[PDB]
Amino acid sequence: HEYEHLTSVKIVPQRPISDRLQPAIATHYSPHLDGLQDYQRLHKESIEDPAKFFGSKATQFLNWSKPFDKVFIPDSKTGRPSFQNNAWFLNGQLNACYNCVDRHAL
Amino acid sequence: HEYEHLTSVKIVPQRPISDRLQPAIATHYSPHLDGLQDYQRLHKESIEDPAKFFGSKATQFLNWSKPFDKVFIPDSKTGRPSFQNNAWFLNGQLNACYNCVDRHAL
Fold first, then answer.
1. Which residues are paired to B75 by β-bridges?
2. How far apart are CA A106 and CA B20, in angstroms?
3. Which of A95, B2, B15, B19 sits most deeply, having the most CB atoms within 10 A of its CB?
4. Nearest residue on chain B to A95, judged by CA atoms?
5. Closest-CA residue in chain A for B73?
6. Which candidate in A66, A94, A97, A106 is best for mutational testing of the B interface (most B CBs within 10 A)?
7. Could you give the C-alpha distances from B65 to A97, B48, B55, B59, B91, in angstroms and in order?
8. Which residues of chain A lie closer than 8 angstroms to B70, CB-CB?
9. Which DSSP letter does residue B93 get?
10. How far apart are alpha carbons B58 and B89 in whole angstroms?
């Protein structure tokens, strides 16, 4: 059709890998997302309310010097983040080098 | 011997002083360390785990603008403080003048 050639392909499922794990993780390896169904529900949450999805991951994985007050600046017409006045983690402070090196080196 | 002359001396114990106290402290004076046995146990703790000994005194006697996260950077081979990368009270903030003057003047 209009791209019928390009898109007319078979879907390839992903096979589990256990036999390529190195001893370092062989005893505890587990994927961060369990399946498509978690992607789907998590994605939904990420779009519908970023305030919680990013809000939490932002403090769980980054080491802040000063906590932030607002996850994002909303668009007046909708609860989604604004393009023109895009800003996140307002009023917090964070040093990239700290998170990249010192956090682990120490 | 090898310094037998120099070191061959009598030990002089310290005598209590109460009769040289001024009225200002005469009613409440008490030494900060009670005896050699406290020196000995406290010293032991100071060497074995500085994290607590200095860690606490650091916040009890200095007025911090921002609390610190780490008492010190350890030596990879031992729990003691590193000479080459010596640093203490990491990530806190402290103004020396504040502690020297304003803290008391106010």
1. B78
2. 51
3. A95
4. B91
5. A106
6. A106
7. 22, 29, 16, 11, 11
8. 106
9. B
10. 8
Between CA B87 and CA B70 the distance in angstroms is: 9
Q: How many residues does chain A have?
A: 106
Experimental method: cryo-EM
Resolution value, angstrom units: 3.5
- Token look-up 């103004």 returns B95
User: Within 10 A of A73 (CB to CB), how many other CB atoms are there?
Assistant: 14
Distance between CA atoms of residues A36 and A11, nearest Å: 14
Residue B49 in contact with partner chain A when CB distance is under 8 A: no
Q: What is the DSSP letter of A93?
A: B
Q: A18-41 as b/e, with b when 16 or more CB fall inside 10 Å? A: eeeeeeeeeeeeeeeeeeeeeeee
Chain B residues whose CB is inside 8 A of the A94 CB are none
Q: How far is A58 from chain B (nearest CA, A)?
A: 19
What does the alpha-carbon distance between residue A74 and residue B6 come to, in Å, rounded to a whole number? 80
Q: Does B73 touch chain A (CB under 8 A)?
A: yes
